[PDB]
């Protein structure tokens, strides 16, 4: 079972700045701008480039103790970031691997658009839990909004 979902969120931060902060410098912001959702992000292998394995540890009381995202592509010129949840988190009997892509497209009005493409690999003939999709959407939204607030409050951070 391979299931594809697409979302298109918006932001008021310029695309270059938002990619520089939200995607590139996400290890130093997510545990700082949204500590109520992510306890700590740490590259347990690699340094952020392709093949990096980021372990994301959540605070107490969340359903999952940690997730591991295998960073696959980071295109700085087109602001593209392809990673893959491979271990921990929602990946048990049902799921196997969640291939995610985030592309930050600059809008003419000055903001930016996050085009997010997720692809779940359910084992056998299992369905994607709607609660899992909702939780992933909520986590993405809270991280994006927290980074957006960090960039709005600190107008000089990341150019």
């Amino acid at each position: 079972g391979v299931f594809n979902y697409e979302t298109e969120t918006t932001s008021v931060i310029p695309a270059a700045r938002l990619f520089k902060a939200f995607i590139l410098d996400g290890d130093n912001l997510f545990p700082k701008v949204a500590p109520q959702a992510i306890s700590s992000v740490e590259n347990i292998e690699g340094n952020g480039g392709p093949g990096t394995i980021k372990k994301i540890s959540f605070p107490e009381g969340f359903p999952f103790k940690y997730v591991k995202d295998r960073v696959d592509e980071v295109d700085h010129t087109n602001f593209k970031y392809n990673y893959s949840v491979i271990e921990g988190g929602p990946i048990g009997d049902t799921l196997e691997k969640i291939s995610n892509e985030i592309k930050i497209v600059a809008t003419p009005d000055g903001g930016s658009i996050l085009k997010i493409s997720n692809k779940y690999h359910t084992k056998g003939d299992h369905e994607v839990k709607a609660e899992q999709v909702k939780a992933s959407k909520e986590m993405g939204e809270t991280l994006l909004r927290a980074v957006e607030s960090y960039l709005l409050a600190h107008s000089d951070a990341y150019n």
Partner: antibody, heavy 120, light 109 residues
């Protein structure tokens, strides 16, 4: 397989500048920090400076802080460490080590080590 | 800057004897991020233990790491002749990444 080969042993005059090259193969070069570790004949290990090719920057130790410059060439995938204002006490074995992770900062693969002898 | 000290300064035990090496940190090493390397006299330091408990790949099942906080121990149960080298402890729980001083495991006779 991961392989970090280095240049050959070099003799330098005091006050000159040495350049040690480390060719890294078997992994995505842009995706791993590389540290430079000096070791005297009997002294312990002391890192000099690290290069982050993904974040595209470098960070040196306070002890050296200027005499050492860490550059890289992703095309041939090599790491260059230049030591300037060499002194008679800088004769040592220099290793290039591959930092496993950006947070799991233990070096799993080291170079063979270039012996740099700085004497008059 | 976490200063690491190793004890004893130079261990010397007969082959086949349990050897215990202690690494002590000035501050606390977060999440037991200590790595034990072994350097032979003329080779690059090979990584033995990472995470202060788990052995690396291709390591014989006799190097056991333990400890946390500011006190860690590396244990070699059966000292083979390929085990008398200089053992370094490096903390990676707090930047900057700092090494130890080394314990030259000698041979008693």
């Amino acid at each position: 397989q991961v392989q970090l080969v280095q240049s050959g042993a070099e003799v330098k005059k005091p006050g000159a500048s040495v350049k040690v090259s480390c060719k890294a193969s078997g992994y995505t070069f842009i995706s791993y920090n590389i540290f430079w570790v000096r070791q005297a004949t009997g002294q312990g290990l002391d890192w000099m400076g690290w290069m982050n090719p993904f974040r595209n920057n470098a960070g040196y130790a306070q002890k050296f802080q200027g005499r050492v410059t860490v550059t890289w060439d992703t095309s041939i995938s090599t790491a260059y460490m230049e030591l300037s204002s060499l002194s008679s006490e800088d004769t040592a074995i220099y290793y290039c080590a591959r930092e496993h992770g950006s947070s799991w900062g233990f070096f799993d693969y080291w170079g063979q080590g270039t012996l740099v002898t700085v004497s008059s | 800057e976490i200063v690491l000290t190793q004890s004893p300064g130079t261990l010397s035990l007969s082959p086949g004897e349990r050897a215990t090496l202690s690494c002590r940190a000035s501050q606390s090493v977060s999440s037991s991020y200590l790595a034990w390397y072994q350097q032979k006299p003329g080779q690059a330091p090979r990584l033995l233990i990472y995470g202060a408990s788990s052995r690396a790949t291709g390591i014989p099942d006799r190097f056991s790491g333990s400890g946390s906080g500011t006190d860690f121990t590396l244990t070699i149960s059966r000292l083979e002749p390929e085990d008398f080298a200089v053992y370094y402890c490096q903390q990676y729980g707090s930047s900057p990444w700092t090494f130890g001083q080394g314990t030259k495991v000698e041979i008693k006779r």
